[PDB]
Amino acid sequence: NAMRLPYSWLREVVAVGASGWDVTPGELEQTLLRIGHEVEEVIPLGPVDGPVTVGRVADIEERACAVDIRQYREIITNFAVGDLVVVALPGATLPGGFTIDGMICSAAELNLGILVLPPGAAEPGADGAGVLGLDDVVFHLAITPDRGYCMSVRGLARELACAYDLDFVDPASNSRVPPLPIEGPAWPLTVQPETGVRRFALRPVIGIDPAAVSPWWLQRRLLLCGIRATCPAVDVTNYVMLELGHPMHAHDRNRISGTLGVRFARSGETAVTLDGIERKLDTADVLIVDDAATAAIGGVMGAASTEVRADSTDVLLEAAIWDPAAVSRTQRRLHLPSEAARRYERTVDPAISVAALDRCARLLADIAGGEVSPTLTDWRGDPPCDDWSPPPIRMGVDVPDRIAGVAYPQGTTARRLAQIGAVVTHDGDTLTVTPPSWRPDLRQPADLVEEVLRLEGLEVIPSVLPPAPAGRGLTAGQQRRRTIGRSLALSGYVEILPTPFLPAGVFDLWGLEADDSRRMTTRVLNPLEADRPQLATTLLPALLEALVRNVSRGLVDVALFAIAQVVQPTEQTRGVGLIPVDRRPTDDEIAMLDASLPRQPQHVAAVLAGLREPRGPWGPGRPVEAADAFEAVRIIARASRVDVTLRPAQYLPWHPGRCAQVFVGESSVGHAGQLHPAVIERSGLPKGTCAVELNLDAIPCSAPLPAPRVSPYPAVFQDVSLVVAADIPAQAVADAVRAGAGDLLEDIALFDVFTGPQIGEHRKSLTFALRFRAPDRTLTEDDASAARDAAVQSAAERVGAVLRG
């Protein structure tokens, strides 16, 4: 999308209509930025100083060289006797700091592009700074795809004429290119109308001198634009393509067999380009073919069959307009970023096809000693078209004012739209705007609004805050993710941003089964690393990766968490057909598009390793254990304002004896605990690594409205010791005691877990602290003991508890 030109050439085209126009290169870049042209880089040429002049070599010694600089010196690849060269004698400076009986400079050493000036470029001894034009400044521009007309000096000079409100003289006009005589056809021509070609012009130039080279001003402009100049007939086709934006190609007229045909490639043909390589063709590709071989790939690349060489004496230039889409799909497959293809895919002004041809035929004969044949073949569709203008656009006169929010002076819209080349008529308060042929991007009133606003300047648009709409703030879920993040950080967890790309076979490290639901992932066609193309079904691999980085760098006591969504496909990656953009998709089409996507729920996860409690004057600290992962669950559950229940469970990569499945009501919401030791060793993780992962979408949103009533009466404190099998969870006993104790039970806490031979084998004694309180009376000890006995009975029936005797 780049476009490079020197300032001298651009200023020249602008100076034709506005004589004396000259601006500072910084101002030019600033003005180009203000109207919407990204100035990538501003390159000044050179600079040289001191004895750097031109000269002609006189003798060759196979390498010594005799160059006449009013003097005569001798200096020690691609030059013959009599050629003008650039000489740098030991004197002052040279671009790059390298101080130079001298040196024959090259285009790269002069900070310009060895370099051989064409015969007659200058007189031996002339100051090389002026001969090469080192006071010039080359501009590197990034052209957006909507402004293909700016891929030329014509488009950029017109843009500057609009910005500076200057008189502009189109270099493609009839006064700068006078029509050449049309006394008959130039070559037999046929075109399949289904190929998408809009125009095809042909004009020949007979008897060109093969020993003629391009003048210096033409070669210098081609090089400053990034195109190597070889010979005229191809130098003029590139020069005209750069000046007017119409790509041009020259054929060898004596190398065309029979009539010229433009049609689609039938099956898998091939063609050898100017470079020299056979390229596979598609059945939807447009080409110019003769009765012998293929002449060129339609608007992409020319072929060596008809390409001009150093023996060409008759040239036949072809000014054509190809389908932008056909050239786009063709240039991308063959890796051909051709200057012609890059402009054709971004549209080319079809009205200047013959004008650009007449400029090519005349300029070639003027420098190569040829004759312009007064013959032209100009195919313009069926029927032959004569008006290449886009359709007219109706728009209210104050529509740009409304969209800009500025009351522009009257006639601003009409003046600006006429400046960019559009025909504007008035009908009451409604304009009818017909864009010029080189502006196919102008299709809707919005396109016209941008033209007015960017030319007036977006800086004149005032900053007016819109009124605040009566919003509802954060959703319940969004508030929950904040509270969960705040609570985990305050509890000693450090948040990370998890990557959605799974490590190389991470599930194989976890030892997951082949039918594990986590293994059903969504894959990526072009990943950054070929061994990590799978998307994340769980947040743990990303957290465990960030844990390894911290531990491997000296931070061995870590606790990280992450609140992000995952990816869980329920089938093979299915695609949805294209729905027309010109209308709103029905709600049934929307639901069809959602079902073809993975579920992607919001998850919270955490990993822990090393010391959970740091050491200090209090003591030596506590290493991470499974209970710390369960406490993270209770931290998340308290932040979510829900109650969770943990049950023992087996679920890789967790340790089956140190793993809890988390439940909200009856719905499973995730797992927590210590990781399997084999998984730890096979992953390089620290020993005893613990982990949590919850599905926040499976946890329902809750906003309870408690109505506490504080009883002013005293409480009764009691403790109960219950013996249960070792496998009975302590929370189960607590729930059974609560269910039996009734409404008098105000609080219950476990403070003792005792094993030993006093208790049976594989049994345990649990002592709970109980607090009873009535809302309307003081209790007797018998009142509390009655509630305690009912709790003991409930624990006997629910978990088989036995009162400690």
Binding site: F630, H655, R658, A730
Partner: protein, 47 residues
């Protein structure tokens, strides 16, 4: 240490591959018991 004398009499790679294969077997054998004993070890009260 000639191509001779540097061949037979230096091909103790079979002795190293046999000593390795005895280690690779015991490594997979002992890893299987550890993974098995983990499934039968006494769990914790996760509540």
């Amino acid at each position: 240490v000639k191509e001779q004398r540097a061949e037979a009499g230096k091909r103790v790679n079979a002795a190293r591959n046999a000593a390795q294969r005895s280690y690779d077997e015991r490594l997979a054998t002992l890893r299987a018991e550890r993974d098995a004993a983990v499934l039968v070890a006494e769990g914790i009260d996760v509540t």
